[PDB]
Design a protein around this ligand. Structure first.
Ligand SMILES: *C/C=C(C)/C=C/C=C(C)/C=C/C1=C(C)CCCC1(C)C
Ligand SMILES: *C/C=C(C)/C=C/C=C(C)/C=C/C1=C(C)CCCC1(C)C
Ligand SMILES: *C/C=C(C)/C=C/C=C(C)/C=C/C1=C(C)CCCC1(C)C
Ligand SMILES: CCCCCCCCCCCCCCCC
Ligand SMILES: CCCCCCCCCCCCCCCC
Ligand SMILES: CCCCCCCCCCCCCCCC
Ligand SMILES: CCCCCCCCCCCCCC
Ligand SMILES: CCCCCCCCCCCCCC
Ligand SMILES: CCCCCCCCCCCCCC
Ligand SMILES: CCCCCCCCCCCCCC
Ligand SMILES: CCCCCCCCCCCCCC
Ligand SMILES: CCCCCCCCCCCCCC
Ligand SMILES: CCCCCCCC
Ligand SMILES: CCCCCCCC
Ligand SMILES: CCCCCCCC
Ligand SMILES: CCCCCCCC
Ligand SMILES: CCCCCCCC
Ligand SMILES: CCCCCCCC
Ligand SMILES: CCCCCCCC
Ligand SMILES: CCCCCCCC
Ligand SMILES: CCCCCCCC
Ligand SMILES: CCCCCC
Ligand SMILES: CCCCCC
Ligand SMILES: CCCCCC
Ligand SMILES: CCCCCC
Ligand SMILES: CCCCCC
Ligand SMILES: CCCCCC
Ligand SMILES: CCCCCC
Ligand SMILES: CCCCCC
Ligand SMILES: CCCCCC
Ligand SMILES: [Cl-]
Ligand SMILES: [Cl-]
Ligand SMILES: [Cl-]
Lengths: 236, 236, 236
């Protein structure tokens, strides 16, 4: 295994496990049901990812596949543990944003469905040879568009409607999510699974940076935002 | 791949994707929550199947297995993508019928459980050699019986009790479902997985006709029925 | 296959199928929704396990793997059908105990999450070589600790708070569960997957005895307890 990959996995595991300690002890100490739910959701997020990173750090959850002539020179290292992690953790992150926005349940169900299909077709893409890999990559990207038509549409609207004097708070919530979410397909397609701009070591580093941003630091941002809304009296 | 199979997959993909356009744009435009839920459920149904048909059309999601002497002459083409599709789409079709009938949640949970086990044991059957394949086929058929004791019993009863002057409407809902649902195990057992009456091409054509009936045209029937009930004032 | 294994699988299948008859006919005959839910949950428990035992009895659902020098002499027989069964049946048993205790939903979600991760890391452990197998075994055991901090904490507390004059009833509910639940990791680690104290035949017998205890006889205990609470008037 690439050394940069090896190190990125151990570093992601430890950072994610730090988040699990914060969220887990928060759930243990929370008295209000809405804080128990928040912490339990975000504890699952970091803990599932921390398990996936532990497996990759130990040399598991990976399969190496040959590339064709319609692909980058060499091979692709498919860390299928990533998609097992993502199919569970990304619907939970979206669920958390939706609960903070207080949006109706039909939008929650629609955004979770779009997200699960985005991940599933992403994993099909990763295992596919070209040109099928590229067809599935585009299908996965269109499911990502459907996530954002729901998020920046009905979810954001319900967030602005049911809260007062917190436009900048929710703007940061949706803007920061929007940025790291769109970075994943870019990081993916610039590696060996698309254009051979960089190899599996750099890709592993970039994904790890995205993962700790989305699961630990973004979680802390939603935590702080919940505190702000509670001190204002518009949390529940 | 068989040409009739190849064509049936492309034809099913396009027809299913037509349904996804109808249901998806209906969800986008729906103002009432109960219409949002209806369209989102049926959009998932056609879209998941359309993805499975795209994979099979492109030559993926299939494994060919040898038959024993207790089986039809030749081999069996197992399109395992079918069961990944079915384990998600058939509980959603049943959920839609149950919501239209306004039945209590315990019956919804019971019918979904029976259905998921029907599909799982069906996939075990398909991967099994004889005689195990035949044992699992019978077990799967008994789970299908359990679906209908719930459907034609408590679900239908609650549909007739909580609605007025729409006996013929609900009769068609349960009768049309009953017919295509029982056709699947027949189509399955007359192909190479049971009696060798026809090969994988004809079976692929028959399944595709069942799939577009159940997911597109039956969906349009439930759509029209929802409109009828709404114009009568007994939708919610 | 080991004869003791062969017999234990057929015996477990028949005993589990006996439980499915009791719980299934109870669901069919139940008039109150809360009894319908109880029977449907416990019918799923025995029926899913009975399917898994039928597969193992017929020689399916098993893979044999080589052991290293950091492991017991010989091989490990991994019945992966067990974990497919467990990932579905153990969250349902916990759900049933939580509903009987009338605990808030956040605790139900937390205990189900801990349980699913316990089973998943257990299956990773089983497929892993040493030393990874031992790392995952410990991780799985820590998820089991997290189940019991929730169960003996918030769930038990809510059981004592919302019921009168039934301390001994609930004490038996949590004590009997506690005992068989902790026996599983012990049985697992004393077989070929840990210390080579006994082989796959004895392990298969011990698991089968645990499985019928947890799914049939413990189910009958919760049934009798529900009857007691109903005759007292504190069931719902
Ligand atoms: C904690 C993990 C997170 C936030 C992961 C997010 C993942 C995505 C937004 C995935 C995107 C993909 C595409 C739209 C297509 C190409 C492949 C994927 C699966 C990386
Ligand atoms: C859109 C897909 C639909 C409506 C599929 C329905 C599938 C079934 C009713 C499956 C039935 C099966 C049996 C009862 C046993 C033999 C194999 C199966 C899985 C085809
Ligand atoms: C009906 C099945 C039941 C009650 C199964 C319960 C299973 C467990 C408590 C599993 C425990 C495990 C560990 C904590 C680690 C080692 C391996 C497992 C998965 C056996
Ligand atoms: C000792 C090396 C064996 C390699 C195979 C062991 C199986 C590893 C499975 C890892 C799956 C990770 C998914 C994480 C999501 C919870
Ligand atoms: C959403 C349900 C559809 C399930 C279809 C799974 C297809 C997986 C295909 C994996 C690629 C293997 C063949 C590679 C051909 C380029
Ligand atoms: C519902 C959980 C049970 C999971 C059992 C999976 C069994 C799959 C067996 C596949 C057939 C392979 C062996 C073929 C022997 C005829
Ligand atoms: C990794 C830090 C420990 C995490 C503990 C997770 C369990 C959460 C407890 C939920 C409240 C239980 C109080 C009875
Ligand atoms: C405020 C009420 C929230 C209810 C959430 C229900 C969402 C269920 C999602 C299930 C997965 C998506 C299936 C289409
Ligand atoms: C294939 C046709 C497009 C399907 C779009 C699916 C997204 C559904 C939108 C739900 C309402 C969002 C309004 C903000
Ligand atoms: C009208 C209320 C509907 C509630 C539906 C709950 C059904 C949950 C099904 C989960 C799968 C089945 C598990 C046994
Ligand atoms: C194995 C014994 C039969 C089990 C039947 C399971 C179906 C449960 C029926 C639920 C009530 C349906 C009444 C209309
Ligand atoms: C009394 C209300 C019960 C509601 C139960 C909700 C539990 C949902 C569990 C879903 C799996 C766990 C995900 C973290
Ligand atoms: C080997 C590259 C290190 C990158 C660290 C990035 C810190 C934000
Ligand atoms: C090569 C590992 C880089 C670690 C970056 C840490 C960012 C918080
Ligand atoms: C060993 C290959 C496993 C593939 C799992 C894919 C999960 C999305
Ligand atoms: C090759 C057979 C064509 C079948 C078309 C059926 C139209 C309903
Ligand atoms: C061989 C493909 C037949 C297509 C039938 C279309 C039915 C609507
Ligand atoms: C490559 C074989 C996959 C089998 C998947 C079965 C899903 C029901
Ligand atoms: C071969 C050992 C039989 C064990 C039976 C145990 C009865 C409780
Ligand atoms: C060797 C099979 C033992 C069966 C034990 C039955 C316990 C109820
Ligand atoms: C043939 C190996 C299947 C492994 C399935 C593991 C399910 C937890
Ligand atoms: C956390 C310990 C990992 C040991 C590496 C095999
Ligand atoms: C693997 C090199 C041959 C592929 C041509 C598309
Ligand atoms: C305000 C939501 C979209 C922001 C993305 C830059
Ligand atoms: C490989 C066939 C291309 C499919 C385009 C939808
Ligand atoms: C594959 C032919 C031999 C099988 C006999 C049951
Ligand atoms: C009226 C429901 C059953 C009809 C099947 C022909
Ligand atoms: C192959 C054994 C037959 C099992 C019948 C239940
Ligand atoms: C399989 C025997 C060699 C393993 C040494 C750790
Ligand atoms: C009273 C619950 C814990 C009992 C375990 C022996
Ligand atoms: Cl390629
Ligand atoms: Cl055969
Ligand atoms: Cl080993």
């Amino acid at each position: 295994m690439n050394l940069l990959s090896q190190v990125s996995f151990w570093v992601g595991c430890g950072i994610l496990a730090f988040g699990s300690i914060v969220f887990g002890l928060g759930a243990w100490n929370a008295k209000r049901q809405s804080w128990e739910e928040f912490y339990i959701v975000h504890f699952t997020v970091t803990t599932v990812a921390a398990c996936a990173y532990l497996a990759m750090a130990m040399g598991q959850g990976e399969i190496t596949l040959q590339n064709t002539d319609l692909a980058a020179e060499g091979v692709r290292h498919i860390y299928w543990a990533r998609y097992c992690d993502w199919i569970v953790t990304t619907p939970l992150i979206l669920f958390s944003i939706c609960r903070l926005s207080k949006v109706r349940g039909t939008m929650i169900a629609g955004i979770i469905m779009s997200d699960v299909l985005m991940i599933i077709t992403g994993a099909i893409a990763a295992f596919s040879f070209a040109p099928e890999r590229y067809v599935w990559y585009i299908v996965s990207c269109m499911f990502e568009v459907a996530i954002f038509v729901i998020l920046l549409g009905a979810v954001r609207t319900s967030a602005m409607r049911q809260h007062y004097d917190v436009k900048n708070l929710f703007n940061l919530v949706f803007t920061v999510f929007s940025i790291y979410f769109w970075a994943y397909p870019i990081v993916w397609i610039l590696g060996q699974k698309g254009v051979g701009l960089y190899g599996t070591g750099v890709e592993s580093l970039l994904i790890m940076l995205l993962d700790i941003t989305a699961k630990v630091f973004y979680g802390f941002l939603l935590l702080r935002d919940r505190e702000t809304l509670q001190r204002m009296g518009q949390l529940s």
